[PDB]
Structure formats: C-alpha cells, structure tokens
C-alpha cells in the first residue's frame, strides 16, 4: 500500500483519475494510465475554510 | 493517440487490434485453403506429367 494525500477544491476532484488532463492532473499530481487503487475525498470546510 | 488521452484510447486501440486481427485470421485461413487446393492440383499435374 502506498497512500497519498492532498487538499483541493470540490469540483476539482474530477481531475483525480487515470490519464486525465487539467491543472491538477498535469502540473500538480498525475495518476498513471494503468493506476490501480482507490481515490477518496471529503468535505473539509470546517477545517480548511 | 493525439485526440484522446492515454487510458481512453486503449479500449479504442484494443478494439482496433481485435478488428485488424480478425481480418487477418480469416485471410490466413483462406490462404491455407487455397494452398491446399494448389497442392492437390500440383500433385495431379505431377502425376499426369
């Protein structure tokens, strides 16, 4: 198991998937096209807002 | 490989490879049938000679 973590917008989580393109997908964090695993996200306004 | 992104081009590449292999398998089968026919004709021609 390797586990990664980070903070992003709500709609921006759409970019977290294999082979995607975008600001996060291209210039901050990119998943390999053959990535296997799970992507997990949740609201964090109570903390990060 | 230029319009679509790596992991959504794969099912497309997979389908293209399947279609191009199914068109070659039948070609090889027809070639084998025609080669068997030519071999029978050549055996008959050699017997006649």
Max Cα separation, chain B? 63
Q: Cα angle at A25 between A3 and A11, to 5 degrees? A: 90
Method: cryo-EM
Residue A32 · residue B21 · CB < 8 Å: no
Q: What is the resolution of this structure in A?
A: 3.3
Cβ-proximal residues to B6 (8 Å cutoff; 6+ apart), any chain:
A18, A19, A33
Q: Do A18 and B10 touch (CB under 8 A)?
A: no
Residue A42 · residue A26 · CB < 8 Å: no
DSSP string across chain B: --SS-HHHHHHHHHHHHHHHHHHHHHHHHHHHHHHHHHHHHHHHHHHH-
Residue A5 · residue A39 · CB < 8 Å: no
A47's tokens: 């903390």
- Choose the mutation target among B2, B3, B7 for the interface with A, i.e. most A CBs under 10 Å: B7
Phi and psi torsions of A9, nearest 5°: -70, 175
């Amino acid at each position: 198991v390797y586990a990664d973590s980070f903070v992003i917008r709500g709609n921006e989580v759409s970019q977290i998937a294999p082979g995607q393109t975008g600001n996060i997908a291209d210039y901050n964090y990119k998943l390999p096209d053959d990535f296997t695993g799970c992507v997990i996200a949740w609201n964090s306004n109570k903390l990060d807002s | 490989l230029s319009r679509l992104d790596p992991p959504e081009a794969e099912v497309q590449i997979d389908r293209l490879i399947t279609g191009r292999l199914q068109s070659l398998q039948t070609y090889v089968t027809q070639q084998l049938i025609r080669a068997a026919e030519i071999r029978a004709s050549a055996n008959l021609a050699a017997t006649k000679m």
